[PDB]
């Protein structure tokens with residue numbers, strides 16, 4: 409709930425982990441001032457495309473991001489301002505939830521899947537209750553803290569850059585409008601990823617075809633392991649009108665209701 | 678740090694909810710309209726599948742109000758969950774600004790309209806058969822623990838003169854195990870307790886069934902016409918019920934006024950109704966006097 413500030417010499421980037429849409433994530437290390445200790449961290453480098461020379465000083469979209477802590481979100485250990493912004497977080501070796509469900513597939517219990525639905529939902533609830541909009545929620549951006557604990561990552565990063573199509577809501581695609589309920593849409597797609605064990609949304613199609621496809625009434629199909637009750641949720645997540653879509657309170661509560669009976673809502677053998 | 682388990686031991690609902698794009702089906706004509714929205718008759722052509730399926734497309738008019746469509750999604754849920762020759766099934770939904778339920782078309786449409794337009798070419802053996810099919814459909818609905826809170830002739834569709842099905846489900850509610858009653862609407866079709874206490878049960882749908890069979894036996898007459906929704910409670914408390922239809926014998930009318938008993942358990946069950954109307958349908962001219970047969 410307090411934002412720490414690093415100087416650039418305290419941080420060092422060891423290996424590239426991967427690049428995405430916004431920034432590039434390095435596995436790096438922290439060596440504090442006047443100490444010789446190396447503490448393994450995750451340093452995400454965001455390039456300054458503001459032109460105003462954006463990131464030389466701490467803005468508080470930045471402290472806002474830095475002043476959040478919840479059991480099911482990735483806490484931002486510290487930030488480092490400069491020509492490039494550096495976001496330092498814990499290095500979670502278990503990796504992304506996407507890769508996990510892709511590797512273990514059905515072998516994970518239905519209880520785990522429903523519970524992860526719940527956890528992602530309460531993380532997002534914490535974020536929404538504190539006015540934080542994610543703008544990039546996906547299965548790739550949910551990391552495993554524990555084999556049973558998941559945390560939401562890459563939140564608030566999107567409004568660091570100036571003004572992913574398969575996780576975006578229609579208003580987001582058409583008018584660049586991002587809301588907590590657009591994050592709900594994204595949540596629905598994320599859960600779809602989860603319960604299809606890491607399937608690629610709208611695989612056969614091309615990015616051009618997706619928004620119109622959505623506007624013509626078609627959706628991501630019902631997952632093989634999904635009861636009608638669970639798919640109904642994703643469906644209401646993917647509503648065109650925003651104020652119809654569920655809120656995160658309710659999403660968390662209903663996935664909780666389901667979690668209190670895993671086999672009735674998911675069928676895996 | 679997991680949710681602790683409390684198993685229900687109830688079967689998963691593996692109903693398939695199919696989703697279609699609006700370009701897969703066309704709207705030809707209007708079949709019905711109102712504040713609910715509009716029902717269209719149209720053609721569905723699935724993608725890559727090349728069958729042309731005559732369909733009814735129900736589209737909701739107040740898209741923006743949340744629970745107008747909460748009610749549409751519950752409706753879609755129920756209609757996608759049922760599977761029975763005498764109940765209409767959902768073929769899929771189209772999610773747009775407007776939700777559109779899509780079902781298989783029934784050429785002859787509303788049954789009320791049918792028993793009205795074809796008033797004197799209708800034998801006893803069609804009417805009794807219709808009663809049987811409806812009782813069967815409602816029996817299936819009963820043992821899937823969902824209550825059709827709006828059973829009436831308006832809501833029975835006609836596939837062929839010999840085959841009808843049940844529809845709506847816009848008010849229909851699912852009852853869980855150890856959920857005998859539902860506490861919450863067409864006043865002249867409801868049971869007394871549904872008017873006085875807002876209680877709906879499977880035995881309330883039996884009252885609705887009785888009124889329905891009365892509509893059929895009177896060839897589409899209006900229940901309690903001239904009597905307003907305001908007062909009927911009182912008439913029912915005086916013991917007054919619907920009149921005996923001119924074609925009905927004392928046994929048929931006995932069964933239907935048995936559907937309208939105050940004690941809800943004293944009313945017949947759909948099981949019973951299937952048995953008794955099947956037994957009557959084996960000799961129709963003995964239970965209904967309609968000449969022209």
Ligand SMILES: Nc1ncnc2c1ncn2[C@@H]1O[C@H](COP(=O)(O)OP(=O)(O)NP(=O)(O)O)[C@@H](O)[C@H]1O
Pocket residue numbers: 425426427428429430431432433450452482497498499500501503504544548549551561562572
């Ligand atoms: N805390 C972390 N611990 C371990 N690996 C991480 C962590 N955060 C991010 N990564 C990895 O960083 C890699 C790429 O980073 P990044 O490009 O920001 O994420 P992404 O998967 O591409 N999603 P996005 O960029 O938001 O569209 C992925 O392989 C992640 O597993």
Ligand SMILES: Nc1ncnc2c1ncn2[C@@H]1O[C@H](COP(=O)(O)OP(=O)(O)O)[C@@H](O)[C@H]1O
Pocket residue numbers: 708709711713716732733780781782783784785786787831832834844845847
């Ligand atoms: N599949 C269908 N085939 C023919 N007619 C239909 C069909 N669905 C609805 N209708 C027409 O609409 C009415 C029944 O629709 P219903 O679902 O009861 O609407 P609501 O629920 O708004 O009352 C009937 O009068 C019937 O003529």
Ligand SMILES: [Mg+2]
Pocket residue numbers: 428548549561562
């Ligand atoms: Mg990421």
Ligand SMILES: [Mg+2]
Pocket residue numbers: 831832845
């Ligand atoms: Mg109606």
